[model samples]
Target: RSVRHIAIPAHRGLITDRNGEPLAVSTPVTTLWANPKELMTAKERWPQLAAALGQDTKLFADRIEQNAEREFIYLVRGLTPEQGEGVIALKVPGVYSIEEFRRFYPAGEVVAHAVGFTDVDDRGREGIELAFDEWLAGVPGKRQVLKDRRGRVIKDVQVTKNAKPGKTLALSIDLRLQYLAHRELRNALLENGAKAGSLVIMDVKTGEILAMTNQPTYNPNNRRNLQPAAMRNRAMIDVFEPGSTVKPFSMSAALASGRWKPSDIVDVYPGTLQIGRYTIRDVSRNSRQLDLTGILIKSSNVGISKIAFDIGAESIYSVMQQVGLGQDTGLGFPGERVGNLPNHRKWPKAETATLAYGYGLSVTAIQLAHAYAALANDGKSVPLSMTRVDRVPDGVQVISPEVASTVQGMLQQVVEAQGGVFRAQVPGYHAAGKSGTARKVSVGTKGYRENAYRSLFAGFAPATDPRIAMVVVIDEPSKAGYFGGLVSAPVFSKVMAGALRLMNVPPDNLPTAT
Candidate 1:
């Protein structure tokens, strides 16, 4: 019997997708080990083995002398089976290898974030690897073997602890949707001169996350180029002011409360409303006493503010809270943020007025989509989920279905009508969404960057029935023009159009090309 010294991870099973798609797999490799005692006895010839193996002769000789306790030490890891065979054939005294496996992701860059890679031990480090690590990491199958004094295996012993294979994890994300979103968002980020961008598409009916993508993405294959920004899952983790995209929530509340109706007119006066020192203004000057429908179609900040003033901030805040703002979507993501929702203690008049128009509030893209999903699904506030839901997830009543339906109809006009979301309108499908452009915040008296902007578009498509709810956000699009209508909506249109088509959703509105 040989002395049992070190225990290393070996003979582990792979982790894969439910469809048997390779997620995390291990490839057989060799590790180089050295026994210093044998090297020391070789004297002048010790450098010969060291030089051929790409090791420092002096360093190897010194370690041979230094370590008296451990007879063996690893030199390098992850050589192919053939390479291992070749190295072993050299038959240098006190030199050998322990068979090990290196994890591989064949899908590579396409599913880098979702599939995630592992270290030598097949332990999950990030992505689904970390999320479902307990399931993905299998029980180790160990073998006890007889070895010689020179630190080489002589014969195999009985197997102990037969490997308990890891079960495959089936993510709710569709690979096709994931690739399309990644391709579009990454391309848009690069071509649009955007500092960053993200796209998230989900089923409005079910909270199943279909696809989530972020620009400046990294390929897990060659990790040298991985930047901190590339690792960020901005769709669920990062927060920003939603701008005019917040209007629908206020409109939903207004209609639901019976305080305002779609036809009720409000004297918006001009696009701008003077609240405290800051004046809130609309993007265009076409401001009049617009009906509730007008306020949304034109996306009048002043108009929405006027109605918000009537509804009172607390009522609007509570409604937004119920629909999923200022909180986690309950997806249980690693870095999910609840964002900043002003409590009663911190609430101020200016904050209230600003919040009404999607300012003075912060939310993640997932949070925004979740709230809009409530609207799309007829006021049913369902939980957002990354994993598949076997049953129809029961939801809480956020707003009446009637109110949601009314708003949904109005949202349709915003996309199909003349003045509303022209760029967001899909050529053959009926889609609805709101555009947002907000100045990037700065510090030290620089204030907000009027020139530098975050562009956003959030909506549900096939608006009449509502199958998909998604958002597109691009940060700091270079100055050719940074408005949401000009930047985010176009990207949103392409993603939504393609997605709706892929889902085979019937065109609810039957749009004719202009």
Candidate 2:
């Protein structure tokens, strides 16, 4: 017996959602090929094979003639398994279908930026797919066989190495929730006339991101437009000043420092305060004095500025640091950036005030959610995971559980149809969230643009016993009002409501509460 050897390629692994719905799979599509010698003069059946493959008879016949002396040529490339099988069943002395694993997406562009795509060689190129390439790549085997000179195998020879298949990579995302998050955000962006936006929802108990969707995303299934624009996973990737979203962190500082209490009233009358030349103003002028919660509910910049200064720069800096500002988050997502949590000890009061209300420092949506998650999780901070979290930690405490719970109660009052946000409420659930309207700094300018605002909403649900934390940032809304309460609230409530129900969470708010 003579010998022959070949490489045996192992199949790639499946990328599935938490619930096991396929997000990405390597499909074994058949590529129809031929040994030119076998089909060179099988003219009677030539037209039939050409017709089966939807090829022009002349072109099909001519290629056979072109490579008449050769052993192989392509008849067709990439046929579905079923289609390829039917063709081979027709007769395969010359015609055959070679299987190749083609990376494919079922969720398509809706879950594109999260699931990511693979290269033509079936290699992961982006997102979670690229993040765990080693686990999802296969090893080819060195195989050998005993064969006769005529090319018929006589006996089997030992394989030098056995091929190993790639392993399945599961993610925290539930495709159902991803689709829900995707649709609502896209609708909100179109309806609100936004430049762009991002929404990320996380399971507070697990620190697992269930859904992270953004507008102006791309389809990984096709990349005709990849070179023209950024196909960024913006949730954790893009950083911007969080505006009033950080107010609660400052509130935590005030509470922790014992400089303020939830019951104490702060005068915001005249509705504006001057900070060493820079000014802090409240949009709502009706309130002369507000309890600490009242100040937060009103989203009063004047009251927070007063509290920030009283609490001292160190108190606020410590709070921000504890809440994960400027944290890398260790998500392993490519392009994720952090905002610096500065030491405000020697900083001017003017700079200090900006930090209090969330402007002097920047934050990614993931980091923003990280802080909110701590607030919702009773003062604990857990490292987030893209994959499922099985029995993790009690998490490290960032604040007193007392302070965190108190803030949760205080935050609940904000979505009570605030002068700030409406339609932010979820049916049968008490939503505790803060809205932000941050002015974007103009390009090549020292000060922020007068009207270029990024709207934001960040908080958790079922306020009584929190389960989920979410953050939404909508850039430069042009229509239907640009305030976070107006532009971002609806998308938040819609997605939150759906996520809550999908999680089978019972309503925390009821028709009659004694």
Q: Which candidate number has the best TM-score?
A: 2
Candidate 2 least-lDDT 10 residues: 147-156
Q: Quote each prediction's TM-score.
A: 0.88, 0.91
lDDT of 2 by residue, 1-514 (tens): 4677767767788888888889888778888878776776467898888889888999888888998877657777778999999999988466766666678888887888887777877677788878888898889777776755433345668888988889998898978889998999888889988888888988888888888888888777778767534478888778899889999999999998876789999999999898677789888789899998988888889898888878777888888888889877888886678877766438788777888998878889888988899999999998888887778656889999999989998888888745645668887789999999988998896988988899999989989888999998999889789888888888888888888888889888886121
Candidate 2 colliding pairs: none
Against the reference, the lDDT scores of all candidates come to 0.77, 0.84
Model 2 scores what on Cα lDDT?
0.84
What is the clash count for each candidate, in the order shown?
A: 0, 0
Off by over 4 Å in 1: 5-20, 32-76, 86-97, 114-122, 345-349, 444-447, 508-514
lDDT of 1 by residue, 1-514 (tens): 3745344454334544323466567677788887666655667766776676677988877767787446677766788878777877877776778777777777676667655666545676777777777776667666666777655566766665565656666677766777788888877787779998888888887788888788667777678767776777787778998888888888887887777777898887766777778887777777677888877888888888888878888878988888989976666676678998777765555677788888878999888888888889888988887766678788888989988888888888787677887888886778878888898888567468657799898888776678889899999989457888878887878888788777777766554533
Give the CA lDDT, 0 to 100, for residue 195 in model 1.
93
How high is the lDDT of residue 100 in model 1? 70
